[PDB]
Design a protein around this ligand. Structure first.
Ligand SMILES: *[C@@H]1O[C@H](CO)[C@@H](O[C@@H]2O[C@H](CO)[C@@H](O)[C@H](O)[C@H]2NC(C)=O)[C@H](O)[C@H]1NC(C)=O
Ligand SMILES: *[C@@H]1O[C@H](CO)[C@@H](O)[C@H](O)[C@H]1NC(C)=O
Ligand SMILES: *[C@@H]1O[C@H](CO)[C@@H](O)[C@H](O)[C@H]1NC(C)=O
Ligand SMILES: *[C@@H]1O[C@H](CO)[C@@H](O)[C@H](O)[C@H]1NC(C)=O
Ligand SMILES: *[C@@H]1O[C@H](CO)[C@@H](O)[C@H](O)[C@H]1NC(C)=O
Ligand SMILES: *[C@@H]1O[C@H](CO)[C@@H](O)[C@H](O)[C@H]1NC(C)=O
Ligand SMILES: *[C@@H]1O[C@H](CO)[C@@H](O)[C@H](O)[C@H]1NC(C)=O
Ligand SMILES: *[C@@H]1O[C@H](CO)[C@@H](O)[C@H](O)[C@H]1NC(C)=O
Lengths: 254, 361, 50
């Protein structure tokens, strides 16, 4: 089942500043009170991140190129964002990855899905509307896990496709800021590595409708792109990354 | 010292001759818990097996596979591998396993082989010439056979062309034995391709039904999810042992650690990028890895024209781990420590000197 | 078929360089000991080329 959403309001996408967000742990190694210089796919400091809204009538679910990695920031309340769409052609010709968080659990599937043009979930004011696919033909990998999840929650995610490994890094942050990304430092812990072994070049966010037509709950999210660069990470006595230096930002940090 | 200096006469002084090593005593291999086993119980010991023209293919992936239980089982009458070794199945890793399960006649058990030509090989189940994996077969006369005859197991008897490897054919097209036109209508020279077996308990060995499971391995660029079991040994602390923790190997003394790791972190490094902290995979505890007490063995002697008495200094080595005296330079064995102070003759270090008068320090 | 040329199909360990093994003792290819008697997973080490 697929439904075209035809009550949207046309608006150009927004852009904002990354500040010092997007940092994650490059490895599984504890380090204590030391400065480590590392070369990896990192999000540039103070970079131009793309800002998408869901407000009422805004409903931003486009398809974007994956590039070498995706930083997903979510200023979220009442859990509108539920999962992601990963693939190359997003049809039954190729093999696509589905990440969903419904009302019970998180499901990760690598199969040949026929995606709708407008995929979504739905809550009736009770979740009783699933319109994200029309078919599922050839599955190679299934993984059911524990659930990952004024704007009250901030959700940071890093998705990477390196050597057939899908790295999901994530961080939950309690914020109380109204509109934009807060300015601060929070290193993203590694959550889960997926043995997918598939080509991914495009992605799409999955939202949830509110029914009482449809109504979009208040949510906002941000897409940033990972580039190969060097960070100088500071590890404290307790072993958490408290500060970082982008070696290619300005000559002082160089 | 004469060996090191390449001379038969040694001048008075201190000479670093050798390197004391604390030899590793044990080998400690700690690997995490062997959980999420591959479902071989629902393939080898299922309720009803499939026919050979419609052989059941089970995909074994994202699990750890214990081939030792399968190999040590004496119920299997045939265990023949064509691309791997049976004793190295628990050591190698593969991306995925295809398990092809079917039932055939006892005389056709040899027909599941690369390069083998038969009716089952040509029309029912074909293996490639570069086949990797193992064919396992066992007798099932007590289960499959019925006194009225088990006709449920069908097999393909006729086809125009031979099979490609790992190709199924469940089609029921009427074969043309002759050149007469058949539109699916059976005649004098047109027969149904699938025939039923005659499994009965009165037949001897060779006509009894044999259940065959064929395991094929894939080694593509996908990650090797299917691996063998890991046999972790017991953990020994406070000794210079060879540790192997999740593929990270080395030699050290494994002691208790006060470093509280975050739950995603496994190893620990200092400023100089040396692994000094680690997490045991079996029990989530943090262990410090102190390097074994290596030291320099130095020989303190007067001239060989004077005397042949020597003393041995083990540098940075405590005296309980080797006329025994403890210095800040190390442990000195063979020199009598005195309370008197003289001029320095042979320097030991940290204010300690040695002289000959016996050897005193 | 010339079956006079034989090779060692089964052995417990790899040879040394310039090491010759002519011992016709049985091999234990399974968990069950063989006791010098052929049987299940008990094979002669020397098999002939066809
Ligand atoms: C929602 O809108 C999309 C965009 O037009 C529809 O996708 C097209 O559907 C027509 C129907 O025949 C096809 O001919 C086009 O090729 C489709 N375009 C693409 C890019 O795939 C979609 O069908 C609409 N949803 C429903 C339920 O009608
Ligand atoms: C971000 O990009 C948009 C268009 O791509 C541009 O208008 C805007 O000025 C950029 N922001 C910064 C801080 O450069
Ligand atoms: C992955 O997909 C992109 C476009 O979908 C293509 O250009 C690229 O060659 C693909 N890579 C591989 C390894 O197939
Ligand atoms: C969530 O998805 C899983 C898998 O698709 C399903 O088993 C479960 O019933 C779903 N829960 C709800 C509340 O829809
Ligand atoms: C994929 O699915 C299609 C139809 O669902 C099928 O014809 C094809 O054989 C399948 N391929 C694999 C590799 O499973
Ligand atoms: C480190 O942890 C201790 C608790 O053991 C805490 O008192 C201290 O403030 C922490 N320091 C930093 C820099 O996080
Ligand atoms: C049936 O086969 C499975 C194969 O994994 C084995 O674990 C199980 O013990 C077998 N059943 C019996 C009763 O031996
Ligand atoms: C693994 O096995 C050990 C064996 O003692 C057990 O104590 C532990 O609870 C198991 N699970 C984990 C997650 O370590």
């Amino acid at each position: 089942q697929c439904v075209n959403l035809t009550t949207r309001t046309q608006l150009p996408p927004a852009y904002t500043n990354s500040f010092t967000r997007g940092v994650y742990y490059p490895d599984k190694v504890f380090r204590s009170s030391v400065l480590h210089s590392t070369q990896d796919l990192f999000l540039p400091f103070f970079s131009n991140v793309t800002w998408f809204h869901a407000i009422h009538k805004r409903f931003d679910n486009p398809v974007l190129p994956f590039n070498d990695g995706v930083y997903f920031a979510s200023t979220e309340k009442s859990n509108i964002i539920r999962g992601w769409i990963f693939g190359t052609t997003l049809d039954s010709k190729t093999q696509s990855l589905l990440i969903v968080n419904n009302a019970t659990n998180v499901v990760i599937k690598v199969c040949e899905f026929q995606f709708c043009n407008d995929p979504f979930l739905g809550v009736y004011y009770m979740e009783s509307e699933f319109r994200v696919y029309s078919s599922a033909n050839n599955c190679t990998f299934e993984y059911v896990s524990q659930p990952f999840l004024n704007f009250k929650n901030l959700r940071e995610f890093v998705f990477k496709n390196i050597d057939g490994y899908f790295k999901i890094y994530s961080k939950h942050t309690p914020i109380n800021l109204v509109r934009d990304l807060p300015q601060g430092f929070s290193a993203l812990e590694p959550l889960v590595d997926l043995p997918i072994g598939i080509n991914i070049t495009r992605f799409q966010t999955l939202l949830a409708l509110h029914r009482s037509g449809w109504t979009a709950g208040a949510a906002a999210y941000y897409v940033g792109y990972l580039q190969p660069r060097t960070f100088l990470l500071k590890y404290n006595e307790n072993g958490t990354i408290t500060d970082a230096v982008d070696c290619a930002l300005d000559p002082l940090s160089e | 010292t004469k060996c090191t200096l390449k001379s038969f006469t040694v001048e008075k002084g201190i000479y670093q001759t050798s390197n004391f090593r604390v030899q590793p005593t044990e080998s400690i291999v700690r690997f995490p818990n062997i959980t999420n086993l591959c479902p071989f119980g629902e393939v080898f010991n299922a309720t009803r097996f499939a026919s050979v023209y419609a052989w059941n293919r089970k995909r074994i992936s994202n699990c750890v596979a214990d081939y030792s239980v399968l190999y040590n089982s004496a119920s299997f009458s045939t265990f023949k591998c064509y691309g791997v070794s049976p004793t190295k199945l628990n050591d190698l890793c593969f991306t995925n396993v295809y398990a092809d399960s079917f039932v055939i006649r006892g005389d056709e058990v040899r027909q599941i082989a690369p390069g083998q030509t038969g009716k089952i090989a040509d029309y029912n189940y074909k293996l490639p010439d570069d086949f990797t994996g193992c064919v396992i077969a066992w007798n099932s006369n007590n289960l499959d056979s019925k006194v009225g005859g088990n006709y449920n197991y069908l097999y393909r008897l006729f086809r125009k062309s031979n099979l490609k490897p790992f190709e199924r054919d469940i089609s029921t097209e009427i074969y043309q034995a002759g050149s007469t036109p058949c539109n699916g209508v059976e005649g004098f020279n047109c027969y149904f391709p699938l025939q039923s077996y005659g499994f009965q308990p009165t037949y001897g060995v060779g006509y009894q039904p044999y259940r065959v499971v064929v395991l094929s391995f894939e080694l593509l660029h996908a990650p090797a999810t299917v691996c063998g079991p890991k046999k972790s040994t017991n953990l020994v602390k406070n000794k210079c042992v060879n540790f192997n923790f999740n593929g990270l190997t080395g030699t050290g003394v494994l002691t208790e650690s006060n470093k509280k790791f975050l739950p995603f972190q496994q190893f620990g490094r200092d400023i100089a990028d040396t692994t000094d902290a680690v997490r045991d995979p079996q029990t989530l505890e943090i262990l410090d890895i102190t390097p074994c007490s290596f030291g320099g063995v130095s020989v303190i002697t007067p001239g060989t024209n004077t005397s042949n008495q020597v003393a041995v200094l083990y540098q940075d080595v405590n005296c309980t781990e080797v006329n025994v005296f403890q210095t800040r330079a190390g442990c000195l064995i063979g020199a009598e420590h005195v309370n008197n102070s003289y001029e320095c003759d042979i320097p030991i270090g940290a204010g300690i000197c040695a002289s000959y008068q016996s050897i005193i320090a």
